[PDB]
Ligand binder design. Sequence first.
Ligand SMILES: Cc1cn([C@H]2C[C@H](O)[C@@H](COP(=O)(O)OP(=O)(O)OP(=O)(O)OP(=O)(O)OP(=O)(O)OC[C@H]3O[C@@H](n4cnc5c(N)ncnc54)[C@H](O)[C@@H]3O)O2)c(=O)[nH]c1=O
Ligand SMILES: Cc1cn([C@H]2C[C@H](O)[C@@H](COP(=O)(O)OP(=O)(O)OP(=O)(O)OP(=O)(O)OP(=O)(O)OC[C@H]3O[C@@H](n4cnc5c(N)ncnc54)[C@H](O)[C@@H]3O)O2)c(=O)[nH]c1=O
Lengths: 216, 216
Amino acid sequence: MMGRGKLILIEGLDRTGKTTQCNILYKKLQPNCKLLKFPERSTRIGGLINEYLTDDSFQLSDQAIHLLFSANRWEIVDKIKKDLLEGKNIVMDRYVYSGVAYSAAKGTNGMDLDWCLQPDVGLLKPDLTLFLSTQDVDNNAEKSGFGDERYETVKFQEKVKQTFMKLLDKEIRKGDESITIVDVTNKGIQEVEALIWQIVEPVLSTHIDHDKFSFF
Amino acid sequence: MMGRGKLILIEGLDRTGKTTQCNILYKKLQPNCKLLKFPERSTRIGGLINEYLTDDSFQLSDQAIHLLFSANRWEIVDKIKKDLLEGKNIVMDRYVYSGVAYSAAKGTNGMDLDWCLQPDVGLLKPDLTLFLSTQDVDNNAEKSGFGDERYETVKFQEKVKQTFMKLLDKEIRKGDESITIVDVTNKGIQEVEALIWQIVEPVLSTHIDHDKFSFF
Ligand SMILES: Cc1cn([C@H]2C[C@H](O)[C@@H](COP(=O)(O)OP(=O)(O)OP(=O)(O)OP(=O)(O)OP(=O)(O)OC[C@H]3O[C@@H](n4cnc5c(N)ncnc54)[C@H](O)[C@@H]3O)O2)c(=O)[nH]c1=O
Ligand SMILES: Cc1cn([C@H]2C[C@H](O)[C@@H](COP(=O)(O)OP(=O)(O)OP(=O)(O)OP(=O)(O)OP(=O)(O)OC[C@H]3O[C@@H](n4cnc5c(N)ncnc54)[C@H](O)[C@@H]3O)O2)c(=O)[nH]c1=O
């Protein structure tokens, strides 16, 4: 009996169409759906992350920016949970996985997968996590804007690639099957969209106890 | 002998003469000494923390503000380390213990001593930590301006007290010998100043193992 909305998470490297697919899925699931994107640049903490990403001159240590990315989710997670309990579904672009992967890829002393994950521990786990994977480097043909932000380098993006796999393989081989890797190499928007609904549709029908959640 | 400066930390509840004592100690060790106080409110992250402490309209989740406090130390730690290596002592008012104890005192689900400590893991440990303890938390709430900040209520300071005790007990019993509790109950500035010097002086002269650093 009963039930709550589902939290659908789409993750992946930069320039892999995630915002695109999320808007599609969100439009598809409306009106009983919410859309959320991290970093959520509209809050003060979000603005700081924004400045950091858009201006590679804004100075901030790896650990400080890392914790800001995580506080950005904590400042929003209560609304997320309120929506889910109201039965609404939530499509989310980027979350804890991006948090850990991007920072740990830096290889900064003391900032290993484990350290990077701790600040997010206790946050709601998404009901389904789609990882849009690709073998297409930075991908000029997928730039989501001008000049290109701080992390958009082929070398670094290549680093986050490994870290993303290592982290996911871990939690997968660890017993988590709510994570699906989707190869989107050379796939157009409609195609990738079809591939995603094939995974998401079934989850939306599956029943979840309104009072039951998983956490990081 | 010549070597690296020492990182001296003074901790305690609100209105326990820490600022006072830190300046006194700082003046004592000059010219070769720096004074640092946390939260360091002059940075952007520092500014948000200040607004949180001074403005009840400023809403931020317990986990979020908790991570800002930690990030605020991370944006300064490279300086601390560099100064010490240059041979400068550093007197610091509040640090990681204040971070853990204040947030964990809240009793917020999932925000326990261990969770609270994680973001600070990797940070330089002070060579010496002095905890100014008072038994009269009731008169603490008498000082002028007491109540103007968020954590300034007798009942909450009560909770922070218990938390600080738990946290220092754990660290001391675990084997941290660099932590000293100083009973400052009903003692004046000069007496407390004398009690602090008695502990600090000897440390300034020692030069443990190749001047190596310790970390949280
Ligand atoms: C949450 C979090 C994030 N980050 C970092 C990761 C990032 O480096 C940075 C900004 O992350 P962001 O998600 O705001 O980044 P965006 O600027 O939004 O863009 P991305 O590079 O991730 O873009 P998307 O992957 O969403 O791409 P999208 O906006 O959908 O598309 C870009 C363009 O390509 C086209 N396109 C889309 N799909 C296409 C397809 N199938 N084939 C061809 N072209 C396609 C689109 O129409 C658009 O023109 O934040 C962390 O380091 N830690 C954290 O904790
Ligand atoms: C680092 C960190 C901090 N915090 C939170 C904890 C706090 O609630 C909040 C503000 O922290 P703050 O240190 O910036 O706060 P302040 O308001 O600057 O300082 P306090 O209230 O702690 O005061 P102090 O204890 O330093 O007191 P002091 O300024 O030295 O003295 C106050 C008054 O009493 C007199 N006084 C001083 N010594 C006296 C003595 N021995 N006997 C009697 N009177 C004495 C002084 O002269 C002055 O008038 O930050 C977290 O939650 N997490 C974190 O990670």
